[PDB]
Design an enzyme around this catalytic site. Structure first.
Site: not given
Ligand SMILES: Nc1ncnc2c1ncn2[C@@H]1O[C@H](CSCC[C@H](N)C(=O)O)[C@@H](O)[C@H]1O
Ligand SMILES: Nc1ncnc2c1ncn2[C@@H]1O[C@H](CSCC[C@H](N)C(=O)O)[C@@H](O)[C@H]1O
Lengths: 322, 322
Positions: B16, B108, B117, B265
């Site tokens: 993306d 993100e 989520e 995305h």
């Molecule tokens: N409470 C929490 N603590 C730590 N990670 C978390 C969380 N809730 C969700 N996540 C994680 O947050 C991510 C959001 S997608 C963000 C992806 C990241 N910026 C990249 O470049 O890949 C996911 O990988 C998910 O596992």
């Protein structure tokens, strides 16, 4: 009110002009055998093949459909003014009661990799129970093909991680081994549409099924398949093998699901190796492919692959449908 | 060996270019605030944003990731020579232990329809627990938009059944009411990418979230949203509404998921009425949209829609994420 209904499968079939026109014309080509005769449509769905049979001149058509969609077929029949000649019967063809034996069976029974869903067994049950001696089966035969593949989309997805540095200034090339384990290091059959850009050697026919032939029901239980041999066209990463099929409507009209032929909703069934294997022009590949019912569930396709690439030892990989 | 790993989500994010470049540049634009400072990356995934933060001059970055993918982020950090400045910490940010409070949080966190989520709650937990007074949040704000839509793909799929007669000589137009019940007569939010060809009135901003602002955590629990009003551009079947968002990185760089803007995305979150409603130029539409946690599961997005089309009475439809 709210409903939950699935409909994408039926729109996929009707939007498949290769599938739908091949059946329309395959049925019409058998006008002489069907005119004034009776037909059983096994798994009639929304009913279009039964109507095609009436339009080819069938005297009477029995459209048998097990799923909830049978009610739509009944409405489609009525909309086309055929309620007096095409009868929609709910439930499995194994227990339906027809008022008569039939002159022909038509059915769209093929699944992914030809045999996923194992519907051919119901067609053959109906042939034994309801088809008159010397009656017509449409399609009448099927053939199975295999080719080694270098999946260009898979190649792109795996290599894309080593391209991140050139686009964002961050090296992520270590994600490539992770993606390979995730995308190839599993034993699922993957349904994906390829093109000739993906085919790495001449496709090989490895089995032929004449649907009316004695002993086919037992061959399905013991495994359909055979050996193959081919020579690679050029240098590429070998990702595994694609399996596809054709069926033939006797006169003969062939409905093919080859990646070299117009795309269809069946796509192809892909058998990925655990990781890519480099091959070159004239690298010899041989093997054996067997299509099997899964032990847990006879309707889920299993594929046992034995393969030998060049000088490497023969390997085995046992796949089951995703 | 065989594994089962999912990887399509991470390849979707890196492929993306709108998402990835907006974060790269949004982080770089805050060079002055980040140089020689410390950063917490909440939900670091495969780690690219943490590396962007180091490349903007962060002194130290804590990359916190709950899922199994944290190990890939640790390898990515090492491949880029940053193991001494970027530390990957597995587990939920709610219980991680940092050695220090941080000068900035980057994350993100946005899901489909912004809040599917419910990850924003973790970012705000981390802001309270770990962010120094007056520290930076990247992105800093989000806005929510709604527009009435005439989904051209949905229109085609529904009308295709009345087109079967012109292509195969079989009338199937009765399948259209069946497809409408299946495709629209449900209460699921549908994630689909639209374009301006689908947008039926000027999009309306219905909510604005400043992430650092007092009371946002309670507003998320009680529902985010607001009223809207618009006037249709022309004659079309109204299929319902699309919701999308933007976020802003302060200087300001805006990452938008509008159907009028380059595709991302996140696509858009579509709220279909039970059946199409004909509208015309200047048909007034008004309503209210509220984004809520689902009662069963706070991480599954619920959307309550109240809407009034022209002279029709106001209707209500309660959606939950597919
Ligand atoms: N409470 C929490 N603590 C730590 N990670 C978390 C969380 N809730 C969700 N996540 C994680 O947050 C991510 C959001 S997608 C963000 C992806 C990241 N910026 C990249 O470049 O890949 C996911 O990988 C998910 O596992
Ligand atoms: N044993 C069985 N008896 C009756 N129908 C069956 C069956 N096994 C599968 N089916 C049905 O067979 C169909 C195969 S798809 C074929 C669809 C049909 N030709 C159409 O035009 O829509 C499905 O609708 C499925 O419900």
């Amino acid at each position: 009110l709210y409903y939950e209904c699935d409909v994408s499968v039926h729109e996929e079939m009707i939007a498949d002009q290769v599938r739908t026109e091949a059946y329309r014309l395959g049925i019409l080509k058998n006008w002489a055998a069907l005119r004034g005769k009776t037909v059983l449509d096994v798994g009639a769905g929304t009913g279009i093949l039964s109507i095609f049979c009436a339009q080819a001149g069938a005297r009477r058509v029995y459209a048998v459909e097990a799923s909830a969609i049978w009610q739509q077929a009944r409405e489609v029949v009525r909309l086309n003014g055929l309620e007096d000649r095409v009868h929609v019967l709910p439930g499995p063809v194994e227990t339906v009661e027809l008022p008569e034996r039939v002159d022909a069976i038509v059915s769209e029974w093929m699944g992914y990799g030809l045999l996923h869903e194992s519907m051919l067994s119901s067609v053959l049950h109906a042939r034994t129970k309801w088809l008159k001696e010397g009656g017509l089966l449409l399609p009448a035969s099927a053939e199975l093909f295999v080719a080694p593949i270098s999946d260009q989309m898979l190649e792109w997805r795996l290599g894309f991680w080593s391209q991140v540095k050139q686009h964002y200034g961050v090296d992520m090339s270590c994600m490539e081994s992770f993606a390979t384990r995730c995308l190839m290091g599993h034993s699922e059959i993957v349904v994906q549409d390829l093109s000739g850009e993906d085919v790495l050697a001449r496709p090989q026919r490895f089995a032929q099924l004449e649907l009316a032939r004695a002993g086919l029901e037992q061959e399905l239980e013991a495994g359909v398949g055979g050996r193959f041999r081919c020579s690679c066209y050029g240098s590429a990463p070998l990702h595994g093998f694609a399996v596809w099929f054709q069926v033939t409507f006797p006169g003969p009209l062939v409905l093919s699901t080859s990646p070299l032929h117009p795309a269809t909703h069946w796509k192809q069934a892909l058998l990925y190796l655990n990781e890519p294997v480099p091959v070159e022009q004239d690298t010899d590949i041989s093997g054996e492919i067997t299509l099997l019912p899964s032990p847990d569930n006879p309707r889920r396709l299993r594929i046992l692959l034995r393969y030998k690439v060049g000088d490497h030892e023969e390997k085995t990989k046992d796949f089951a449908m995703e």
